[PDB]
């Protein structure tokens with residue numbers, strides 16, 4: 001004589017394994033809760049996803065599931081279970097079950113001072129997970145503190161592959177002021193200038209911003225709107241060099257940059273006067289304006305700031321690197337079939 005648990009306007013058809021629901025958060029086409037697992041005997045995170053009315057939500061639901069079911073890595077959130085109806089017809093929602101984590105780095109930074117040892121460890125873990133992601137030819141594309149989950153022992157896992165894409169550097173070019181989907185504060189300068197965010201360098205920029213944020217508890221480039229993001233970046237980095245300008249061939253983007261008053265570099269040791277100098281040298285290298293000159297993930301791991309942890313033999317790579325909303329609903333159905341009874 002049972003029935004499904006309710007949360008905050010939405011049905012959570014997740015029983016009988018998954019009981020005692022607390023609300024965590026929500027978005028455009030879904031809501032996250034915690035719940036008690038019964039096969040294993042721990043509380044878990046469950047996300048309800050309702051994408052089937054929209055093309056791009058189907059694309060994003062499918063990419064996140066295909067990626068995370070492929071990935072196995074200590075610093076990357078996996079999928080433990082997927083709950084949906086046994087028929088496409090009856091399938092209105094998909095529930096993704098994941099390890100529950102205590103907190104995230106956004107909540108941690110707003111409440112907690114980080115010691116240099118914590119920053120170093122968190123950075124190591126971020127980069128170790130990202131070594132794996134990049135090694136599969138995947139870009140996360142929305143790395144930010146709220147997508148970095150932590151447990152009580154400071155173990156870190158990257159989550160939210162909702163904007164993730166297979167890398168595509170041969171098709172990265174676009175016009176000036178091309179709209180972009182990823183979180184504004186962690187967008188690389190080239191996004192606003194000439195990049196679609198389909199190279200690995202776009203993630204390194206975000207990690208740079210994360211590192212700067214761990215050093216002061218405040219976002220480094222908190223732009224209030226699209227182009228103000230570029231204003232913030234150039235206010236610290238200063239004016240691009242002639243060389244770096246010359247790689248920007250779109251005239252509208254080049255002439256914008258040429259239009260701006262000259263700005264000199266703010267040195268990292270003035271923004272971050274209590275920071276480790278090795279941490280600032282790696283920061284400098286992650287926040288390089290020119291994406292071709294920007295440090296890569298494996299090269300960041302080998303940087304002297306990370307020497308206490310660096311062990312390439314223990315920083316694994318991926319074994320297996322990488323439509324209308326009605327054909328995508330069928331791919332989601334196929335892709336989640338393995339978690340069904342029988």
Ligand SMILES: O=C1c2cc(-c3nc(NC4CCOCC4)ncc3Cl)ccc2CN1CCN1CCOCC1
Nearest residue numbers: 025026027030031032045098100101102103104160
């Ligand atoms: O799926 C997730 C997600 C999951 C988690 C998550 N959190 C936790 N523990 C919380 C961390 C903080 O302290 C409270 C506990 N544990 C596991 C996950 Cl897997 C975190 C952040 C995100 C962002 N996101 C996509 C965007 N939307 C979210 C709302 O629903 C629609 C989709």
